[PDB]
Amino acid sequence: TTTATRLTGWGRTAPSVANVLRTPDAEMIVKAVARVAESGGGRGAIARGLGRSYGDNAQNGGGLVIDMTPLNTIHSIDADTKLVDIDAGVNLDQLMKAALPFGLWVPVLPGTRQVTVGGAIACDIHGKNHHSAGSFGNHVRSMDLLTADGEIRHLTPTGEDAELFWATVGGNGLTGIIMRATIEMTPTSTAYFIADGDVTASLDETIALHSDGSEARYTYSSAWFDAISAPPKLGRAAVSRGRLATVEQLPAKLRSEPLKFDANKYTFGPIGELWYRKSGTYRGKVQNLTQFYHPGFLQYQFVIPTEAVDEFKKIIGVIQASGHYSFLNVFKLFGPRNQAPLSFPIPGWNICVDFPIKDGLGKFVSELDRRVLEFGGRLYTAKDSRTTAETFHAMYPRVDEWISVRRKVDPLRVFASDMARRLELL
Ligand SMILES: Cc1cc2nc3c(=O)[nH]c(=O)nc-3n(C[C@H](O)[C@H](O)[C@H](O)COP(=O)(O)OP(=O)(O)OC[C@H]3O[C@@H](n4cnc5c(N)ncnc54)[C@H](O)[C@@H]3O)c2cc1C
Ligand SMILES: O=C(Nc1sccc1C(=O)Nc1ncccn1)c1nc2cnccc2s1
């Protein structure tokens, strides 16, 4: 039933061989964990979703990896309570399509829909709406967690077991296997957005636009920014902001089915600067999800706290003068954090960059880690495969508190991964 498979993260780096169990039968998963628990802990077990983490959080060299994607039943959707009850292997695209006809919207969508609900919880994912909706864990009402002793515990965010609930959110699979969850969805009358677009000429303008108060008027907001040009052009951005449309805001063509989801010689001169400004400046444009949201590399994402604006500008300056060129760059201002110890988002300047693998890059991102740490920020474990334990621990000062929860729920270290070992979360 288990196959020896070479597994990697999305970045296709640091591979390890594991026995991969792939079964639609939940009882076989219970017994596999029972087999691991009795085997003297060994090199343990980890759950795998769709393999979309860039890191090593869903591989376990010389141990067991449980593929959760065959557990992909939607058990119920209720439009009155807004609740969805789903197997942990359901993906967000499947969930999005099943939920729309009930006038229900997935409360947090990331930059891809090909992620499992189990992965969304364990990485406590965020999206364009973080500053208004928080992260994924904010909307989970219950989950069923297969723990180290082969018992399935029913966890809720408040009441008895809250501590373990909140350790599982952002816990990277290290408290056990999420088998099943109940999610509160966002009500919607349409599958469309009304969107405003803005184009800033500089890092100073981009920052200015995010702190001038206009952010409170939009439920969704993010930006593509320039990380390659010299100042003054460094940090200029195309900002995309909006909210879900109501039926009366749609054009007539679309109002019958409101919830249906189905390089030239001018480019780098004054004329195209104008073109790009015109095309990226608009108000009240009706967009579907695809238009608004879903249009040898090292991914790197960090957040710097809100008040550390001058420090944020400095990190961006360090990035462009490094000789490492990142063309695809996402910037967002995060809102309030949640109570999960290992949750990534904190209020502040969030940035995702992507560097081509090249001489000197590993040592340069270590230096970046140091800057991010010193400025009170942290890195995202769904993007990272190379930070040290000591860096991570200083970035997440509630780690000891989390570790304490993990010891009670897994005394024999049944649940283990390459990431847990590297980051000394074991
Ligand atoms: C193109 C792209 C865009 C992205 N955009 C964003 C974004 O905008 N925002 C954001 O937050 N993230 C983003 N991500 C990261 C992604 O959302 C997370 O890495 C997510 O956790 C991956 O889900 P997965 O099912 O593929 O999980 P995997 O990558 O397979 O596993 C991730 C972690 O979840 C745990 N896990 C998986 N299933 C279970 C389970 N049933 N029980 C317990 N633990 C489990 C694993 O053990 C592992 O620790 C992006 C990734 C890609 C490739
Ligand atoms: O974290 C990410 N995006 C974030 S963080 C906060 C907001 C957003 C975000 O808004 N994503 C996004 N926005 C517009 C178009 C496409 N994606 C991404 N990581 C990767 C990695 N590879 C490809 C795309 C992305 S988006």
Author numbering: 7 to 268, 284 to 316, 331 to 461
What does the original paper state about this entry?
Mtb Decaprenylphosphoryl‐β‐d‐ribofuranose 2‐oxidase (DprE1) is a flavin adenine dinucleotide (FAD)‐dependent enzyme, which together with decaprenylphosphoryl‐d‐2‐ketoerythropentose reductase (DprE2), converts decaprenylphosphoryl‐beta‐d‐ribose (DPR) to decaprenylphosphoryl‐beta‐d‐arabinofuranose (DPA), an essential cell wall component. Multiple covalent and non‐covalent4 DprE1 inhibitors have been identified and showed in vitro and in vivo activities against Mtb, further validating DprE1 as an attractive anti‐tuberculosis (TB) drug target. When analyzing toxicity profiles, we noticed that many TCA1 analogs show inhibition of CYP2C9, one of six major cytochrome P450 enzymes which determine the clearance of 75 % of marketed drugs. Here we report the X‐ray crystal structures of WT DprE1, a TCA1‐resistant DprE1 mutant, and CYP2C9 in complex with TCA1 analogs.
Modification of the carbamate group was carried out; however, most of the analogs such as amides and esters are not active, demonstrating the importance of hydrogen bonding between Ser228 and the carbamate group (3.0 to 3.5 Å). When replacing the carbamate with various heterocycles, only TCA020 with pyrimidine showed moderate activity (MIC=2.5 μm, IC50=370±133 nm). To help optimizing the pyrimidyl substituent, we crystallized DprE1 in complex with TCA020. The DprE1–TCA1 structure revealed that the two nitrogen atoms of the pyrimidine ring occupy the positions of the two oxygens of the carbamate group as H‐bond acceptors. Based on these structural insights, we introduced a methyl group at 4‐position of the pyrimidine to gain a hydrophobic interaction with W230 (TCA787), which has similar activity to TCA1.
